[PDB]
Design a protein around this ligand. Structure first.
Ligand SMILES: COc1cc(-c2cncc(-c3ccc(N4CCNCC4)cc3)c2)cc(OC)c1OC
Length: 296
């Protein structure tokens, strides 16, 4: 097994979810995610997407292996992937500023990964449509070629159109609250429409776009890194804090005045806005976002 042969070198993240480690396998770095015994359903879900759907793309974090052992005494659950030494988009944006080329390359690579997840491809290379449900800057990793890939499919839901089957799962985990869409916060989300879940991803994508664009330099000016809604909610905000801001007050992240002196940041401001409509059916699709980014 890949797991018995791996040496854990350093913990690069710990949380409610479990732990992610840098490890060594056959002389190469790998990333190991060790799940809490209480998050067992996430491990299975992510595993079965990778091992049964054969989900593979430049902009989706690359699967190597998955291992589990269980006795009455204890259960260990490991997901092993490629290691990206630059870390998350969240870590990266704190240390670094961007130019037009490197900003476009980041947001274009996210949109490609998301569109690949959302689109149903039939038959031989087959794949159902997949919604992520926890998109955020921490779940995006930065590669050395300046592109990004999307990680963490523990909450993903699938839909096949050859069948009429929606696979939600029975997972007690739910999204990161800061990135939750209006319809999730006010509970008007159409829980039996698969498209509802894609539109929730598009909302979160818009917030990530905002995060990245802030760090693009324009006419000698740049903002510091902030997470969405930094000015109106505390760290680790509650469901209710987010509901007041997003539903009741209808707030969206502020667009700095300086962006409208730059053609690219101007084009990105318009996309962001079309991800954030209160009405989910009015939001753009992942494919359209990709096409619009391609046009610049
Ligand atoms: C976002 O979730 C994941 C991320 C990674 C992952 C893969 N490759 C590199 C990193 C990574 C490396 C360094 C950092 N740093 C941030 C803090 N200080 C510097 C190091 C962060 C993330 C993380 C692997 C995962 O499943 C295996 C995983 O869950 C599916």
């Amino acid at each position: 097994t890949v797991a018995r042969d791996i040496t854990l070198l350093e913990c690069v993240g710990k949380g409610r979810y479990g732990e992610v480690w840098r490890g060594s396998w056959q002389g190469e770095n790998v990333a190991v995610k060790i799940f809490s015994s209480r998050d067992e359903k996430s491990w299975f879900r992510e595993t079965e997407l990778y091992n049964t759907v054969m989900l593979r793309h430049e902009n989706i974090l690359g699967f190597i292996a998955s291992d589990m052992t269980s006795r009455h005494s204890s259960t260990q659950l490991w997901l092993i992937t490629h290691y990206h030494e630059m870390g998350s988009l969240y870590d990266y944006l704190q240390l670094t500023t961007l130019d037009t080329v490197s900003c476009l390359r980041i947001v274009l690579s996210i949109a490609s990964g998301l569109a690949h997840l959302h689109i149903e491809i039939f038959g031989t290379q087959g794949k159902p449509a997949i919604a992520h449900r926890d998109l955020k800057s921490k779940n995006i990793l930065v590669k050395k070629n300046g592109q990004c890939c999307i990680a963490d499919l523990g909450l993903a839901v699938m839909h096949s159109q050859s069948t009429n089957q929606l696979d939600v799962g029975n997972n007690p985990r739910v999204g990161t609250k800061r990135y939750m869409a209006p319809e999730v916060l006010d509970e008007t989300i159409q829980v039996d429409c698969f498209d509802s879940y894609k539109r929730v991803d598009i909302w979160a994508f818009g917030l990530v776009l905002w995060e990245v664009a802030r760090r693009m330099v324009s006419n000698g000016i740049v903002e510091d890194y902030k997470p969405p809604f930094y000015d109106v909610v505390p760290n680790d905000p509650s469901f209710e804090d987010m509901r007041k801001v997003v539903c009741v007050d209808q707030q969206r992240p502020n667009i700095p005045n300086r962006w409208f002196s730059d053609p690219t940041l101007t084009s990105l401001a318009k996309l962001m806005k079309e991800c954030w409509y209160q009405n989910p059916s009015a939001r753009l699709t992942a494919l359209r976002i990709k096409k619009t980014l391609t046009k610049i």
